[PDB]
Design a protein around this nucleic acid. Structure first.
Ligand SMILES: *OP(=O)(O)OC[C@H]1O[C@@H](n2cnc3c(N)ncnc32)[C@H](O)[C@@H]1O
Ligand SMILES: [Cl-]
Ligand SMILES: [Cl-]
Ligand code: NA
Length: 600
DNA sequence: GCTGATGCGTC
DNA sequence: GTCCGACGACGCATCAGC
DNA sequence: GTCGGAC
């Protein structure tokens, strides 16, 4: 009747988490987790003696909070947690503690760590806790439920019970469990391996923490044929970046497939007669949009009769696309629509199948699965299609297909082994992807100017880790530009030393940004920085992006998709920044794509 | 309804 | 060679203040 | 989705 979690204090879990975090090496980290796990299982045998659904799940879901799927979203991140703590603790709204919580990335040695910053605010203001692990999970259920119920007052009540009955140390971990980032220094594969030799593999075919804890409760009992099951979300197979020069060797010198890389959203479909379920890339259920029955949804009523008559059970893997009925073309993922919440029509482009009736297909060759896929339903253009797998054998065909995708303004191509099996959650292992941005020289890059700064968080706390960037207005001959229009934010591509060195150089030039008193040299759209810098003191950065897309957030009216810093252009001066004219040329050069040049 | 904040999934 | 948080974009939903 | 880097 009872549960182990109802007898384990939450402080015992926090003690283990504190020992794992402070532990230096992986051996020490594993040891502390095993002591907690072994003790839990010993207690588990005693309490129950002889059915039982109880398991390590109430503790596992807090150790791996990113894997939580039963509980809905809390609706709370660092900003809301700070506001709630200010209101529940009744902090002076303009005091030092309230401003530190709301501005936890601005340093005042823990800038960028909201939990640690909250801990020091709480240490003198808080009573050692008394809640059990089950009680904590019950209160976390209440917060998620009340967020879904749109009862902010009940969130405050549920959280106030957590604050009152927990020590400052416990609340630091409760905050990390709510944010879903524990910073234990040990990966979820290591946690899984300690729990059971089959936990990782079983999680990849279920995405269900409680099923993993329930089925693999005995570390000696191992499951035999762990596989994809109907109506269970499996982690989809992924694709590694191909080395174009070695593509024939990577395909084992045999024939291979080449298919277009579609710019949609990954989605898997489970079918049993009139019952359908749809799961996203990370396992979230989107049946409400696509349709649980042939009478509801954006997709299911239009595909129900595409299937052959003898198809009772079916598991599909594909890419959800927006189809334009007028132009008979796909609208790429991004602006103006969301395929999971839609005069366009949802089109499901299928490229794999994992089950047909009483037949599991994950261990069949890709060619065999492609053969079965081509016979289990009749395609309906613009509703449900099959991704064509063009056969090829040479490196020169792959380069042609890439240039064809560049010409067609497509994202890229996929290259797959026809003899490979379906390996859930595996990157590569038969699937390769090729984009223009992977080839040196193909991309038209942008030399733009840093104009704004933002404080970092986490491992990049305490420094300006990302930046607001702008382009210049063309000045008369011999003159330098004086007005800049913001284009995009960027915060990746630099090593930590380069970010640190750039931070020391620009340190003495940052000026606090005032939205009611902006600088005249920088014209911002909706997006405002935390600090600005006058252009003459700043630095040019060379930006690689995939394309220029519309934006309501930057003064140029457009921004960059997938931007990153390729080089910090110390060899350029600030006034050598690219102008709005250079941007307009690039934007209309190839419908926004920054790839318009063939590989040779 | 609009705007700006804030959060949540996708990429 | 793998895995992860810190970053980028979006649409949509929700909220408070207007 | 990319990125550098811890592992
Ligand atoms: O960029 P990335 O590594 O996430 O690429 C993988 C994703 O690309 C999408 N996609 C589009 N077309 C295909 C085909 N034919 N096969 C496999 N994946 C494909 C998916 O969304 C995938 O997750
Ligand atoms: Cl083990
Ligand atoms: Cl939904
Ligand atoms: Na780089």
């Amino acid at each position: 009747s009872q549960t182990v979690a109802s007898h384990v204090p939450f402080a015992d879990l926090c003690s283990t988490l504190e020992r794992i975090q402070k532990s230096k090496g992986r051996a020490e980290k594993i040891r502390h987790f095993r002591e907690f796990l072994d003790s839990w299982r010993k207690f588990h045998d005693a309490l129950h003696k002889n059915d039982v659904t109880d398991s390590f799940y109430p503790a596992m879901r807090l150790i791996l909070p990113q894997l939580e799927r039963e509980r809905m979203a809390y609706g709370i991140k660092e900003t809301m947690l700070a506001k709630l703590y200010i209101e529940l603790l009744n902090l002076p709204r303009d005091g030092k503690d309230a401003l530190k919580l709301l501005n936890y990335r601005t340093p005042t040695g823990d800038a960028g760590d909201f939990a640690m910053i909250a801990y020091f605010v709480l240490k003198p203001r808080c009573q050692k806790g008394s809640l059990t692990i089950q009680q904590v999970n019950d209160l976390l259920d209440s917060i998620a439920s009340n967020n879904s119920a749109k009862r902010k007052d009940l969130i405050k009540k549920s959280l106030l019970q957590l604050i009152t009955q927990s020590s400052a140390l416990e609340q630091k971990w409760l905050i990390r469990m709510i944010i879903k980032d524990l910073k234990l220094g040990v990966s979820q594969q290591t946690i899984f391996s300690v729990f059971h030799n089959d936990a990782a593999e079983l999680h990849n075919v279920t995405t269900d923490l409680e099923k993993v804890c329930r089925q693999l409760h005995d570390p000696s009992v191992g499951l035999s044929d762990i596989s994809i099951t109907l109506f269970s979300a499996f982690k989809p197979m992924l694709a590694a970046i191909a080395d174009i020069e070695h593509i024939e060797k990577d395909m084992k010198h045999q024939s291979f497939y080449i298919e277009t890389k579609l710019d949609g959203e990954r989605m898997q479909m489970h079918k049993d007669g009139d019952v359908y379920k749809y799961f996203s890339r990370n396992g979230y259920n989107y049946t409400d949009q696509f349709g649980a029955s042939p009478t509801e949804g954006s997709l299911t009523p239009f595909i129900h009769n595409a299937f052959k008559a003898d198809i009772q059970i079916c598991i599909l893997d594909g890419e959800m696309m927006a189809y334009n009925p007028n132009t008979q073309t796909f609208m790429q993922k991004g602006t103006k629509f969301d395929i999971k919440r839609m005069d366009l029509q949802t089109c499901y482009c299928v490229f794999d199948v994992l089950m047909v009736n009483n037949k599991k297909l994950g261990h069949e060759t890709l060619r065999k699965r492609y053969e079965i896929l081509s016979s289990i339903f009749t395609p309906i253009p613009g509703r449900i299609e099959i991704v064509q797998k063009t056969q090829a054998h040479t490196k020169n065909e792959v380069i042609d297909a890439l240039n064809e995708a560049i010409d067609k303004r497509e994202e890229g191509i996929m290259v797959k082994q026809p003899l490979s099996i379906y390996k859930p959650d595996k990157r590569g292992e038969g699937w390769l992807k090729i984009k223009p941005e992977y080839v040196s020289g193909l991309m038209d890059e942008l030399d733009i100017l840093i104009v704004g700064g933002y404080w970092g968080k986490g491992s990049r706390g305490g420094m300006m880790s990302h930046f607001l960037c702008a382009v210049a207005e063309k000045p008369p001959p011999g003159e330098k530009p004086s007005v800049f229009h913001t284009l995009s934010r960027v915060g990746s591509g630099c090593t930590m030393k380069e970010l640190y060195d750039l931070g020391l150089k620009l340190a003495k030039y940052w000026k606090p940004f005032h939205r009611k008193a902006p600088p005249s040299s920088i014209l911002c759209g909706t997006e405002k920085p935390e600090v600005y810098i006058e252009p003459c003191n700043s630095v040019i950065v060379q930006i690689k992006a995939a394309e220029i897309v519309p934006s309501d957030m930057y003064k140029t009216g457009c921004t960059l998709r997938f931007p990153r810093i390729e080089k910090i252009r110390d060899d350029k001066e600030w006034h050598e920044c690219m102008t709005l004219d250079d941007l307009e040329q690039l934007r209309g050069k190839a419908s926004g794509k920054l790839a318009s040049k063939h590989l040779y």
